[PDB]
Design a protein around this nucleic acid. Structure first.
Lengths: 186, 125, 167, 207
RNA sequence: UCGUUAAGAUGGAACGGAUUAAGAGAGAAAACAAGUAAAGAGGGGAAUAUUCUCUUCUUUAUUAAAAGAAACAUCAGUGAUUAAUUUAAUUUCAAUAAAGCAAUCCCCUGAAAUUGUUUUCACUUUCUCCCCGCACUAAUGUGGGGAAAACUGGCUUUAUUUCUUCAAUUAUUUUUUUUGCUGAGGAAUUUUAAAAUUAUUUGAAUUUUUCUUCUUAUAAUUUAAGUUGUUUCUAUACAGUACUUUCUUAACCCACUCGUCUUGAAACACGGACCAAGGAGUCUAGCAAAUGUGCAAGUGUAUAUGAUUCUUUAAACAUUUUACGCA
RNA sequence: CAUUUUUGGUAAGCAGAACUGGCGAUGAGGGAUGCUCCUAACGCUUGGAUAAGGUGCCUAAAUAUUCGCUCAUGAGAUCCCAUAAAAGGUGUUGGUUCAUAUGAACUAGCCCUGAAAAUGGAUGGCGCUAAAGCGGAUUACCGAUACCAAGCCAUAAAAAGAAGAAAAAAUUUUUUUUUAGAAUCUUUUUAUGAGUAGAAAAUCGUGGGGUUUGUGUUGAAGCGAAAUACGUGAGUUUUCGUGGA
RNA sequence: AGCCAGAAACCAUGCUGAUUAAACAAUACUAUCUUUUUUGUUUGCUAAUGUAAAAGAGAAAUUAUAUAUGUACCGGUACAUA
């Protein structure tokens, strides 16, 4: 015999190929995997890896946030491995150049009206081979409401995890065990 | 032991037997994995119903190939033989069990013209 | 300065520190051999695994023979090595090109009397998988210095005679 | 022609390539990567003058004299037909036990060595290889019992290569017969078969 | 479960496993022979009812060839064997044949007068001689007591090593006698390039060489760059007693009733006479994460209405510019 | 549960702990025999060489070599492990200390006494005394699912990939073979492979449905016996017989 | 070391069984039967095959073991012989 960690079989973690059965998405992963394998550019590998990612991980991105990111180099092209969503807080938009997976209908209309450019990934690959003069961006990821129930358990000291409740009124989980007055505090 | 012939090595013969099928009638002869808290067979005791396992498997460059040296293809109609003209040297037809004698004859005749081997050749005459 | 250490003992029933030391030493499978740079630290670690290992001093002929006939080398990308028998120079002219000690003879030279480029060269070789001895051992049960038949611990010079039997 | 690596001096023969395999992707290819095979070589004592035991065939245990090494690693042998009934046979080293005894250490026979060599010199490996047409005629008879044996011998007898070989065999016999015969003990020894009685210990004896 | 016949088995369990055997059945689809000709029987396709051409079955005979298995041989890889070998190193030795040297002497080794060193007397043989015991012994000799010598041993010289030696163990090397097993792969541009080797060719080197080294150029080759060749045989067969393979007994060796709860079951633990069929983690509600999918500050079209929607359709489709849920 | 450390208890295959390893869930080789001891952890094979242990026969290797000791009218013989003590011995073997080649005194090897139990009986058995005993030493050999080399399988990772003629046969010109680009895929490389409770993935099968393109009275399904059948395997396929939709 | 006498004990003797030895001998009478040669043993049946051991399967002194054996005289003696 011999002694090795997991008997000499290496354990990689995360995805192994896309789960999605969508033909267009299958076509895109084939294309970017090919670009990744041939070129040595890190841009191609990261785009390929991010493209495979499940639904929760790639978030929706607001236009306003995208403008804030592009602000100090507005000559160049933002790529975003998710969907871009529109915003009513954003007053106006200064003609950005954006590659995204999916556009909300209103956002595309606004960007086009502003004189900007909406790119699909196939188009991005065709125009830009190595991500030259590009900026990879992605949105708030941990900010998803579900994750607020994760981490060091609710009601274990200081920890800020949301409980789960039927409703958030005064008779539900707000008496014994959450304040000085009635047993121990939070 | 090992059963070599030419390019075809198959490692194992004697079709694996469900334990205890020798000595009770109800126990079916085709394989089953013994579970058991303690039972000989799962526990790999010496000289008793040696468990199958994948490593016995035939070589991957000769995996399904008949002693014909051609892959078996089951045929129930002359239309289905339309592909196999282009592989006549490497696939062999078997005429499906259901197929009636008039049709069967026609299939044999087409195959002969096409220069492809027919394995159950003398069937139903 | 150098010491060739041969492991003597199974996987099963091993004290936990001894197992850890073995892992660092780099002798896993039961008849594995490796060169170790004598120091203080290495010698103490070796002392901990002592009842489980024979070891000794090579001589030039032994190194040369062993490196050619039973040397394997780590070919692939970082920490995913894959085991290739040495066979020709282009393999070692890749990895040890930077350190200017490429050439299989050059590897013998670095090992035999400890050269400056030791840690890489030792690391780079795969651990020696050895064949058992022709006339057997005498007893894995006892030390070489116990006046009985016996084998464990320091054998100094005589390690070469043993290696020659079991090459 | 030779290759002399590490001082060995092995010696090379032109050999054909005959096995074809279907190749990795497209066509077929010849198997061999080589064209020159190393020559056979022999057990140290084997040379023309030695008397040897035939160990395998129908004539087993007869004592026959070696003649010519026939280039290709196969040798010729005769225990003169007119003395001892052994024909002109081709045989391998590993089916023939060569003794230390040499015909040309008998001094009447030692004058006749060059002549024996010339008669030998004419025959060659190509003379013993059987012709396909002859075999086919023979096979074509098969599809009473006495007739079959008779016919087979008749077909064999007809062959020109056999006739040519047989002529040489008779000539060698004609050259040798009285001279071998006159030394009576030696004649009897040649005539007599090899044997392996309860007395013998094969490994122990210096054969 | 039981009958008939046949075949086999049969010394206080029966079957079984791993490997062969002898029987008994089965089989040709890889387990030989393409084509060519002769002349029968069919079928087709084309050319512009008859020319051309492709064919399958039969027959006669008539040449291929390949395929596997053998046997030996060559490699390469991995072993086992029985012979060896280089210059070192380590207190090695021993003869040879001429000389010599000392006598309890000598190479040695004993026992004595912060460690050296020197000195005392102690230690050999004998097929020698002498004396007592005279044949006394286990002894073709002897017990005791004395001498003798250098034959024997030991040393010093001088040559000498195939007369006979020249060890042993490391060290570094270099071979060789038989020989066991293995042969994956198959290279449309890394089966090359280089290495090696051969026949030449140019310049150096040095151990100076008929395996001298390197390097200059050219051809070839394999030790490179995972086994190839010859000859048999199956067989001039058409399935046979050969060959494949099922079954069948054997034989060597092994082998405890399964399920099961159990720290621990072959158990003097429990459940199981047998067989056939049936026979056990589901569905709804509400919640969660995971992941998929659409849309995206929204989202779901509810109930319901509307339709030339009305077998299917108890579904599908549609919903004039702040209803409700969750966000 | 074992070593080692360890508390209670007269002790206990008893009760309770400490550290580690096991066993449980784990085969295989050895310990005759055995859940825990030793060796060693297991894909399928071929050859090699060993471990632990043995080498009189059962039983594969030595009636090996070499020096000792040992006779038993209940010898002795292998970790765990399958009992034996205090006390004796003019048994033999060595010592050691004293005295004048004997008397004394001690000492420790084997051996003897001490040594009694129920079915018959257990060095594993037969047996063994110039041991096949006990204590060494010396070799040589035999000996695993472990080890080395090689093949084959799966798993794991890694390299790495989105167009052209090769050969043979005939008799220079005709014929024969093949002629790859499926991305959860192809080529190749290297490592690795125990498993109850448990989790997963990949398959496979049964009743019905949509979709697709088929078998049926020159005989369907079913069934019985099979088969040079294919699959690691669940199974799949097929032959002959029955069968009548 | 060599020996001796000595117990309801031990073993015979004795006695019982002995398809406990799948044991065995002698004898009386009897059922085409015996020998040699040849060819073969490639409705259940009505010709018919098996080997645990062929390849030269070679070998009658007898007695010791810290001495034997012949022969000759009378276990003794002598002489040979392994």
């Amino acid at each position: 015999g011999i002694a090795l960690k997991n008997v000499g079989r290496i354990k990689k973690h995360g995805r192994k190929h896309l789960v999605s059965k969508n033909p267009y998405l299958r076509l895109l992963v084939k294309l970017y995997n090919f670009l990744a394998r041939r070129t040595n550019a890190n841009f191609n590998k990261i785009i390929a890896k991010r493209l495979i990612m499940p639904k929760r991980y790639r978030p929706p991105l607001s236009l306003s946030k995208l403008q804030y990111h592009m602000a100090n180099h507005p000559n160049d092209i933002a790529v975003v491995v998710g969907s871009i969503t529109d915003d009513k807080r954003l007053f106006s938009l200064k003609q950005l150049k954006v590659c995204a997976l999916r556009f909300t209908e209103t956002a595309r209309k606004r960007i086009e009206d502003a004189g900007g450019e909406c790119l699909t990934f196939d188009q991005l690959a065709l125009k830009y081979p190595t991500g030259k003069k590009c900026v990879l961006l992605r949105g708030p990821t941990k900010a998803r409401t579900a994750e607020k129930h994760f981490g060091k358990a609710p009601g274990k000291p200081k920890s800020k995890a949301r409980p789960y409740v039927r409703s958030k009124g005064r008779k539900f989980e707000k008496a014994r065990g959450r304040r000085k007055s009635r047993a121990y505090k939070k | 032991a090992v059963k070599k012939v030419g390019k075809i090595i198959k490692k194992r013969t004697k079709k694996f037997t469900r334990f205890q099928s020798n000595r009770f009638m109800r126990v079916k002869p085709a394989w089953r994995k013994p579970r058991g808290i303690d039972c000989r067979v799962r526990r790999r005791y010496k000289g008793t119903n040696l468990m199958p396992s994948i490593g016995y498997g035939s070589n991957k460059k000769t995996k399904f190939l008949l002693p014909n040296n051609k892959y078996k293809y089951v045929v129930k109609n002359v239309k289905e033989m339309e592909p196999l003209i282009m592989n006549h040297t490497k696939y062999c037809v078997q005429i499906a069990h259901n197929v009636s004698s008039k049709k069967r004859k026609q299939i044999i005749e087409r195959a002969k013209q096409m220069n492809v081997s027919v394995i159950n050749a003398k069937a139903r005459l | 300065k150098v010491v060739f250490v041969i492991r003597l003992k199974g996987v099963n029933k091993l004290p936990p520190k001894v197992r850890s030391v073995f892992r660092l030493l780099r002798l896993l499978q039961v008849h594995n051999g490796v060169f170790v740079k004598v120091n203080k630290a290495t010698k103490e670690m070796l002392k901990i695994v002592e009842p489980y290992v024979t070891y000794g001093y090579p001589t030039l002929s032994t190194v040369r023979k062993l490196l050619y006939k039973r040397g394997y080398v780590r070919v692939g990308k970082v920490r995913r090595y894959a085991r290739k028998k040495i066979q020709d120079n282009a393999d070692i002219s890749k990895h040890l090109g930077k350190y200017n000690v490429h050439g299989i003879e050059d590897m013998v030279y670095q090992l035999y009397t400890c050269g400056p480029v030791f840690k890489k060269v030792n690391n780079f070789l795969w651990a020696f998988k050895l064949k058992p001895p022709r006339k057997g051992f005498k007893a894995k049960r006892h030390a070489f210095n116990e006046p009985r038949p016996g084998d464990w611990g320091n054998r100094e010079a005589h390690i070469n005679e043993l290696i020659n039997r079991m090459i | 022609k030779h290759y002399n690596v590490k001082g060995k001096k092995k010696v090379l023969v032109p050999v054909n390539a005959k096995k074809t395999i279907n190749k990795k992707y497209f066509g077929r290819k010849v198997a061999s990567k080589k064209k020159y095979v190393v020559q056979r070589k022999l057990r140290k004592s084997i040379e023309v003058g030695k008397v040897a035991i035939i160990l395998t065939g129908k004539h087993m245990g007869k004592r026959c004299i070696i003649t010519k090494i026939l280039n290709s690693g196969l040798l010729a042998v005769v225990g003169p037909y007119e003395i001892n009934g052994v024909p002109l046979k081709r045989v391998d080293s590993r089916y023939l036990v060569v003794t230390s005894t040499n015909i040309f250490n008998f001094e009447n026979i030692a004058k006749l060595k060059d002549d024996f060599l010339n008669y030998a010199q004419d025959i060659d490996d190509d003379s013993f290889i059987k012709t396909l047409e002859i075999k086919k005629k023979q096979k074509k008879l098969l599809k009473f019992m006495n007739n079959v044996i008779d016919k087979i011998k008749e077909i064999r007898k007809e062959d020109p290569k056999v006739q040519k070989l047989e002529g040489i065999q008779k000539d060698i016999g004609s050259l040798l017969k009285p001279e071998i015969l006159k030394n009576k003990v030696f004649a009897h020894y040649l005539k007599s078969k090899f044997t392996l009685r309860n007395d013998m210990v094969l490994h122990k004896m210096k054969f």
